[PDB]
Amino acid sequence: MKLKPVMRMNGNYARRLMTREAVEAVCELVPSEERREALLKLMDLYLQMKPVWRSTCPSRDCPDQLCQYSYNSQQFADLLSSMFK
Amino acid sequence: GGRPRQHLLSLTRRAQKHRLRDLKNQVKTFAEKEEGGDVKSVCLTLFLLALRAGNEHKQADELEAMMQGRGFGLHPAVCLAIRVNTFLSCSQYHKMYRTVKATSGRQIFQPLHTLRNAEKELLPGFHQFEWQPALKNVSTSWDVGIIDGLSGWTVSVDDVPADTISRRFRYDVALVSALKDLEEDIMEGLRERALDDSMCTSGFTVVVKESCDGMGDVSEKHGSGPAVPEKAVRFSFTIMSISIRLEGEDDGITIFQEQKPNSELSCRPLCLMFVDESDHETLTA
Amino acid sequence: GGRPRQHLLSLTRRAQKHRLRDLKNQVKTFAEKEEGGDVKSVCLTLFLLALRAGNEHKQADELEAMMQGRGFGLHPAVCLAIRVNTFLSCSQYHKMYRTVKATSGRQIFQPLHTL
DNA sequence: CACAGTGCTACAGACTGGAACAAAAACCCTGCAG
């Protein structure tokens, strides 16, 4: 991922960190298999709900993520209080 | 019975195909007997003077300036200086260039690639030189430009890390270029002296102040590697004076002396590194 | 035999006169047959095709400056735009102004007080 | 799915030439018409 540590984290290192393939280099670190699957799945959830509030006007640019956002967040929160509680 | 046609300067350059046929043929036929392929001048001498035939002068200034002296627009060296020395970003400069060109142009500034092409002369690894005697344990190749200062670190994992990035001129080349840049001031200094020309060419003495100092708190870039510390070290020199000795007696005789050595304007960077002053290792490497 | 002939670039006007007399006459005759005889309009146009046959861009410019035009002065508002949008310091800008004005100027940029 | 760039690269676009085609512009013309 070609990333270097930060004191305060700028949003740019947040855009490199948030991507799935960034979660790939870390997925290799965690020995546990189902954990490895869990946080990966979490991150894909996050990629699905991020453009809603990131994008300028989701009503056109990204409609399907918007309509599914409630359900998607439900799923997310469930996964957190499940394995990460 | 034919056709009325309006005047030429309103038609497209294309529209022309019909009108110069005979002149293109006549200049072609002409070129072989008196030149052989010298296209520029035949057109130039008839035209300037043909204008000043039914003359108000106004044009003669603009036309006599037009080709060889100087600019017309602005000579690329003047452009280059007016970029480098007012601190214009390349993209910023080009931005301006586009603007001045599009609006009322008649563009003045020269485009980037012709600045770049006017560049190669000022940088080192250009001007030929030779050393008497030949330098010890140094390559004799004089064309070398900016060199990665790592200077052949084998970057084998097994060895000391190659971590530090650096760039440096080959010292001697940087010298001959910095100094030949002073050709103007050294010759004018010589003429102030009213000193002999052909005689006493070789008796010179050059005094170079070199300085190296560290700089901390320099952030770094995510990048592809290699990992490198924050702090940067800038190694630079400046030519303080240049003097003459021959025939003999006569002390040494100053010619050029830097008038304001503390200025930013005269300091010549040579080696640029990312190194902490504290680690001696990579510093001496 | 004959003297070692001229290398262009070295002379004043009347060696130039029979250097081209017959071509200037052919030109007079041409302007006369099809374009009545208005030499200025004819001669200015001549350069373009000889140059632009294999050329520059520079040629489009130097020649395009001619009699019409011009600039004159870049309107002070455009110049001002160039200044604040390329982030030029007043002293840096004025630097540029002085420099472009002294060389070949024909000053282009407008002075500070007018900005 | 921030955005103005960050230089030098890449080669996209801008050029000629005759050889000849075609279309269109705006005249003159002759044709067939009250």
Next chain:
DNA sequence: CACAGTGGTAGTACTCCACTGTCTGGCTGTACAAAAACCCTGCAG
């Protein structure tokens, strides 16, 4: 006894808008020479 800036001002200084005549310098046709720099050929070692 760093240095190369940093913008607004008031300072100064210069250089411009109309009215006019007058001047020198410069161009156009061919005629008229004297220099300019070869190369000839001529007369000599």
